[PDB]
Amino acid sequence: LNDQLPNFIKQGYLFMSHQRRKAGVPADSNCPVTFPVLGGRATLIRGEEAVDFFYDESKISRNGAMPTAIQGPLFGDGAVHTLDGQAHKVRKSAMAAMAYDDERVEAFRGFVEEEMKALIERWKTNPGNIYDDVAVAYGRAAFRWAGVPASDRELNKRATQMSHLLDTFGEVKQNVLSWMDRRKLDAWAEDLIKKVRSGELTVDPDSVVRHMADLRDEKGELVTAKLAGIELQNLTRPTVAVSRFAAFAAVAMVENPEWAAKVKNAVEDADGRLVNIPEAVAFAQETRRKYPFVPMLPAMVKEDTELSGCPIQKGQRVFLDVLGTNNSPQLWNNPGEFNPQRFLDTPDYESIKGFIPQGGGDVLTGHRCPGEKIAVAALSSTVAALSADNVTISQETEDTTFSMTQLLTRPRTGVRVTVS
Amino acid sequence: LNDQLPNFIKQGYLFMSHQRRKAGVPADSNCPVTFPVLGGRATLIRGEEAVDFFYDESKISRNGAMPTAIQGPLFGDGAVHTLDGQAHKVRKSAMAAMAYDDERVEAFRGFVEEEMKALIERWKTNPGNIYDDVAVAYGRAAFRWAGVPASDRELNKRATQMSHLLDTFGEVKQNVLSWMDRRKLDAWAEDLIKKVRSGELTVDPDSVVRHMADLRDEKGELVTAKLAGIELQNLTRPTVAVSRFAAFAAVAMVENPEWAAKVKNAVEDADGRLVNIPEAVAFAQETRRKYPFVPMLPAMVKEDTELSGCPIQKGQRVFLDVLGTNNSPQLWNNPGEFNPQRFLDTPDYESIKGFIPQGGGDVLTGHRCPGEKIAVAALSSTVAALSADNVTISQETEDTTFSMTQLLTRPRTGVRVTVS
Ligand code: HEM
Ligand code: HEM
Ligand SMILES: CCCCCCCCCCCCCCCC(=O)O
Ligand SMILES: CCCCCCCCCCCCCCCC(=O)O
């Protein structure tokens, strides 16, 4: 049983089933599978019992679990993702106060709406693809929502630099570029925070830029302008990432013309309202569940413990299959069908323990992604925006199909689109 | 407009509304009110803008703000409460390192659980009241958590002497007793610290008692053994104080039997454990929010400045309404309702700017209480303990009712309780 790192690069999102299959575990089963990867023992876990385990901070730490080749360029150095104990709780608290606050999310809903409404018209003259153009639109919204005091081009630059990062870090032949993207982005963010603290750059006192500039650590000292800038990115770039979900959502619409028209009816019955449309939210939630984005979640093991008969080791790495539980037939009724009706029946996605496309457990007391609201706020607005008639989504093979073996995958074209 | 010191003694916790009312200010309003008290100009402030102001250490000093009749017996002479500038930052750092460290809080959580679990069993044989008996239990836990090397009698003795202080100070006809209590406690603590420094009494090297005996100031010199004992009390006595919150919490249970049964279910699932129960924790925070303990906070003014049109001058004393802000309908959804559900929606109480029952600014860089963790840890453990069925809280008028004109008020009986 050699190291499974070559298999992970080869299989991509098929790696979870592959290790499951190559271990003799039945299909659709939740049985833990133990295998070596990255020169160490690892156990892939999947299921509701796995989610409760993954977030038991008494047995599961996170620092060092994500390899630096990924955490380095994507999340940045010293980010909230690599923190445990008190230092994390104080950092999440200050960050969930901006992305998880219902008031600030509703403010973002207005920013992302206006930016999208422009594109749908903007495309009519210079059409493009969803992934690239919506990434800029998402970045413009997140930056304006944060109070970033930069020009429009600078906003679009950083937006594409963040979208370029997400496209490159996952491919072994491009991870070197994602390091250059972060190096540039880290410098632009640090300079911004440095000028806010110096008064050269004055921002709104309640803005996200200000709360980042006045960020402090667990010992009560204010973080370095770099870290304050790294963490500002971790509140804007993960929004630019949603353009990949917008691409996936665009494919599902041309594949499900019935639900696409319901959204349309909804937005039509609301005259342009692209936000807070329960139908588009359900479509956005269904896209997050079915389509591949985050393959699995890595975590370290604090002490010798056990999960469902399979024993796991101290200092071991566990992996939570997020694609497998989100589509496990054990936990979902017909997971093969793209059906946003399941998220109109249960709108509170936090009650679904097995719905973990962006994390499980609690968001305030754990590492679960804050701003799933902000993500869906952006994602649902795009579903409503493309639900129109003047918009016709191109359906070439490179527009509708994506590779399951490619990490951070997406339709080749980025899902092209044209508007009349 | 005569001096308002007689009105404060007469009105108690209604004094803030009284000064608000006698100034023509509308009800529930946040308008500052200026009046003379203690032979000097004073301005009562209330609201989020007041909390940010009150802790702007660029405009507000604190030494001399608390009259010696209160600071003297309660906090002790030369305590961290009377410190400004650098000398405070050096002292808080060494003191918040014991009460604000999440690891040490979890250690105290086990002690307060063990001590509370005993009381409910003693009550079966010899029942009493919440205020007095839980004060001893809180003191027994806080002393053992700190590493106090004393017998059971001294632990029980100093604890009741500490609870006696809180009941006696603030009462004009009893403040003389709290001076005698402090003189006794100061001497017992000083003797303890002196024998720890001499090796006559050996304590755990990382215990709170040791970090107090090795306390140093801004001078780089270790504090006098007495002061190390005053500051040791300011990390054990304020825990004995929570028995007043436990008394208030006991009334709220017989007043809200639904949340009481909600906690009961919670503990039953936790297999007896009384700590880290999210339901009991939420119940504990609402008790701290609704019930009167700390009326207002006085502070000195460094330079002439302004708050919402009202000018305040140098050398003035400002008062931050903590009961008025914690129950202002402007800042809370139905603050008249006792609803721990509001603290399940937002568990991070430090993100709530208007929730200031034990301070409002930052705890590490300000004067905010560092024992809010330890406090709720103790208070919620009692909330879980009384949620059982064998526990019957007496509901006579002197058990359920407390005076709002009395300082450091509580039901007269202390909320009596009997268990089968
Ligand atoms: C494309 C949509 C997004 C996806 C797929 C996603 C996914 C994730 C995942 C899987 C985690 C780790 C959860 C865990 O550790 O259990 C995470 C963490 C995080 N996400 Fe997102 N996210 C998205 C959007 C956002 C947005 C819009 C924001 C805020 C602007 C955001 C902010 C964060 C933060 C701050 C963390 C760190 C949490 C912690 O480690 O304590 N994400 N994200
Ligand atoms: C009954 C519950 C408690 C209440 C109502 C309470 C209230 C307060 C208040 C209002 C302050 C001043 C905040 C400010 O200056 O803005 C304070 C300070 C302080 N408290 Fe408490 N407290 C409680 C429990 C505790 C506990 C359990 C501890 C630790 C064992 C503690 C230790 C301290 C210390 C050391 C300070 C000084 C902070 C400073 O002035 O820099 N308190 N408390
Ligand atoms: C062999 C290690 C694999 C472990 C897990 C695979 C890492 C892929 C996870 C993708 C993270 C995507 C985060 C989106 C938001 C952001 O821009 O930060
Ligand atoms: C006339 C001046 C009045 C100003 C405010 C009144 C002072 C009463 C506040 C009581 C403080 C109680 C603190 C409990 C915890 C501890 O033991 O430190």
Coordinates of N, CA and C in Angstrom, one line a residue, chain A residues 86 93 216 220 364, chain B residues 100-102 348 365:
Chain A
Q86 N -7.7 29.3 21.7 CA -8.2 30.6 22.0 C -7.9 31.5 20.8
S93 N -14.4 35.1 16.0 CA -15.3 36.0 16.5 C -15.3 37.4 15.8
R216 N -7.0 42.5 16.6 CA -6.1 42.1 17.6 C -6.1 40.6 17.8
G220 N -4.1 40.3 23.0 CA -4.5 41.7 23.0 C -3.6 42.6 22.2
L364 N -19.7 29.7 14.7 CA -19.1 30.7 15.6 C -18.1 30.0 16.5
Chain B
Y100 N -8.9 35.1 32.1 CA -9.3 35.2 30.7 C -8.7 34.1 29.8
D101 N -7.8 33.3 30.4 CA -7.3 32.1 29.6 C -8.3 31.0 29.5
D102 N -8.6 30.6 28.3 CA -9.7 29.6 28.1 C -9.3 28.3 28.8
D348 N -21.7 34.7 21.1 CA -20.6 35.6 21.3 C -21.1 36.9 21.9
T365 N -7.2 45.2 26.6 CA -6.7 46.5 26.4 C -7.5 47.6 27.1

